[PDB]
Each structure stands twice: as structure tokens, then as C-alpha cells.
């Protein structure tokens, strides 16, 4: 079933985001990807967009108090 | 630690990509997001980029024999590629 799997993924994402090593690794990977294709071409000013957005997403996943809500927002749960 | 968690996430994504309802739902959500902020401004021609990339990503995850590789590519596991 896709809804239980989505809930598990969101739970894992929140747990993972509560670790600084995760944030550092994802930041370095995305900073690298911003300098090369495909992101270099599909996302202008990629590095600045990353610097601004990645903390927002980290906080978003560190604050969500309802996985089912997110999975419904994406269309995987009712 | 984060390596087992990353492998579990990749395994779940691989499992999900085999169901077509997942693909349709993700397409619907991303088409919605492409028409509004922030993606409307951060991704020029968002809808076309989506139409081109989503199938590639679906296939990439449907042809994955070992999650470790992805987790190694992002730096959460010390080996995999
Ligand atoms: C108005 C300047 C236009 C751009 C100028 C470029 C120079 C750099 C200026 C920096 C600021 C630029 C801000 C523009 C950001 C991009 C906005 C954008 O993406 O548009 C989309 C967005 C809609 O997207 P959604 O929210 O998803 O739709 C559903 C919501 N119901 O709509 C907007 O454009 C945002 C609002 C635009 C504000 C336009 C300003 C109008 C000014 C009229 C007043 C007259 C001038 C006042 C004095 C000017 C000062 C000297
Ligand atoms: C669709 C996200 C990426 C693929 C997800 C794969 C399924 C994994 C399980 C789901 C993980 C959690 C999903 C995260 C997205 C949830 C975002 C959300 O619900 O809120 C929308 C949020 C604003 O929230 P609110 O203002 O409170 O609500 C009003 C709605 N505008 O807006 C956004 O999220 C904008 C950013 C959307 C993410 C864009 C992801 C990048 C897509 C790029 C183009 C396509 C690439 C193809 C990727 C294929 C993925 C397998
Ligand atoms: C090989 C491809 C791998 C694809 C990834 C695998 C899927 C695994 C799941 C990944 C989860 C992705 C999470 C998506 C981001 C969720 C964004 C979010 O929810 O945060 C909300 C927050 C919005 O909030 P506000 O509107 O500002 O209002 C305040 C609300 N608190 O989001 C943001 O601000 C940032 C959104 C922009 C980032 C997306 C840009 C990515 C561009 C992709 C280019 C296409 C590449 C092709 C691949």
C-alpha cells in the first residue's frame, strides 16, 4: 500500500533531519549539483536558491506533526 | 544511523515507483506546484522540465538493484557505488 509507505518515508525524513550530519551531507551534495548539469541549467542562481531553501525544507520536515497530512497533500493518502 | 535510514527510504521509493497510481499522483501534485510559487519562479518552464524529468526519475528508481549506491552518492553511506 502506498499510504503506509509514504507515512514511513515522511517519518524517516523527520528522524533524519534531526541530525546535523544529514544536513551537512545534503547541503554539500546539492551545492555540488548546483555547479553541474542538470541543476545548473534547470535552476538559475542555483547556489543562492539552495542556500535559502534547504534550511526552509529542513525546518519544514522538523516541524510537521502529521505525516498523513503531507501524504494526502501529495495525493497518497485520504 | 543515517545509512540504514537512507537505504530504507530508497527501498521504499523503489517499491513505490512500481505502482502506477504513485506516478500519476506525483505528476498531479507537481503539475499543481509548477503553476504557483515558489516553483513557478525557481524553475523556468516548470511543466516542461517536469514532463521530461519525472519519467527519467521513475525509470532510474525502477532499475535500481542496490539502494546503497544512491546513499553513497549523497554521502550518507561509506560505500555503494
Ligand atoms: C514589480 C517589479 C517587477 C520585477 C522588477 C525586477 C527588478 C527587481 C525587483 C525585485 C522585486 C521583484 C518582485 C517580483 C517577484 C516575482 C513575482 C512573481 O513571481 O509573480 C507571481 C505572483 C503570483 O504567483 P502565485 O502567488 O503563485 O499566484 C496565486 C496567488 N493568488 O504574483 C506576483 O507577481 C507577486 C506580486 C507582484 C508585485 C508587483 C508590484 C506592483 C506595484 C504596483 C504599485 C506601483 C509602484 C509602487 C511604487 C514602486 C516603488 C518605486
Ligand atoms: C513531490 C516531492 C518530490 C517527490 C516526492 C516523492 C514521494 C516521497 C514521499 C513524499 C515526501 C514528502 C513530499 C514533500 C512535498 C510536500 C510539499 C507540500 O505538501 O507543501 C507544498 C509546499 C507549500 O506548502 P503549503 O504552503 O503549506 O501548502 C499550500 C500548497 N502550495 O510547496 C512546495 O512544496 C513547493 C516545492 C515542491 C517540491 C518540488 C520537488 C522538486 C520537483 C522538481 C521537478 C520534478 C522533478 C521530478 C522528481 C521526481 C520525484 C520522484
Ligand atoms: C534522482 C532524483 C532524486 C529525487 C528525490 C527523491 C525523492 C525523495 C523525497 C525528497 C523530498 C523532497 C522535499 C520537497 C521539498 C518540500 C518543500 C517544503 O515542504 O517546504 C516548504 C517550503 C515552502 O514554504 P513557503 O511557501 O515559503 O511558506 C512557508 C511554509 N512553511 O519550500 C521551500 O521554500 C523550498 C521549495 C523550493 C525547492 C525546490 C526546488 C527544486 C528544483 C528542482 C529542479 C529540477 C531537478 C530535476 C530532478
UniProtKB/Swiss-Prot annotation, chain A:
GO BP terms in the entry: respiratory gaseous exchange by respiratory system; sphingolipid metabolic process
Record carries keyword Electron transport: no
Main location: secreted
Localisation per UniProt entry: Secreted, Extracellular space, Surface film
Disulfide links within the chain: 3-77, 6-71, 34-46
Keywords: Disulfide bond, Gaseous exchange, Glycoprotein, Repeat, Secreted, Signal, Surface film
Record bears the keyword Ribosomal protein: no
Domain (Saposin B-type): residue spans on this chain: 1-78
This protein's GO CC annotations: collagen-containing extracellular matrix; cytoplasm; extracellular region; lysosome; membrane
Description of how the protein assembles with itself and partners: Homodimer; disulfide-linked.
Role description: Pulmonary surfactant-associated proteins promote alveolar stability by lowering the surface tension at the air-liquid interface in the peripheral air spaces. SP-B increases the collapse pressure of palmitic acid to nearly 70 millinewtons per meter.
Note: Pulmonary surfactant consists of 90% lipid and 10% protein. There are 4 surfactant-associated proteins: 2 collagenous, carbohydrate-binding glycoproteins (SP-A and SP-D) and 2 small hydrophobic proteins (SP-B and SP-C).
Protein name (Swiss-Prot/TrEMBL): Pulmonary surfactant-associated protein B
Species this protein is from: Mus musculus (Mouse)
Amino acid at each position: 500500500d502506498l499510504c503506509q509507505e509514504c507515512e514511513d518515508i515522511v517519518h524517516l525524513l523527520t528522524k533524519m533531519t534531526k541530525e546535523d550530519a544529514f544536513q551537512e551531507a545534503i547541503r554539500k551534495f546539492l551545492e555540488q549539483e548546483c555547479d553541474i548539469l542538470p541543476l545548473k541549467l534547470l535552476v538559475p542562481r542555483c547556489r543562492q536558491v539552495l542556500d535559502v531553501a534547504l534550511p526552509l525544507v529542513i525546518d519544514y520536515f522538523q516541524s510537521q506533526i502529521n505525516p498523513k497530512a503531507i501524504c494526502n497533500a501529495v495525493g497518497l493518502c485520504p
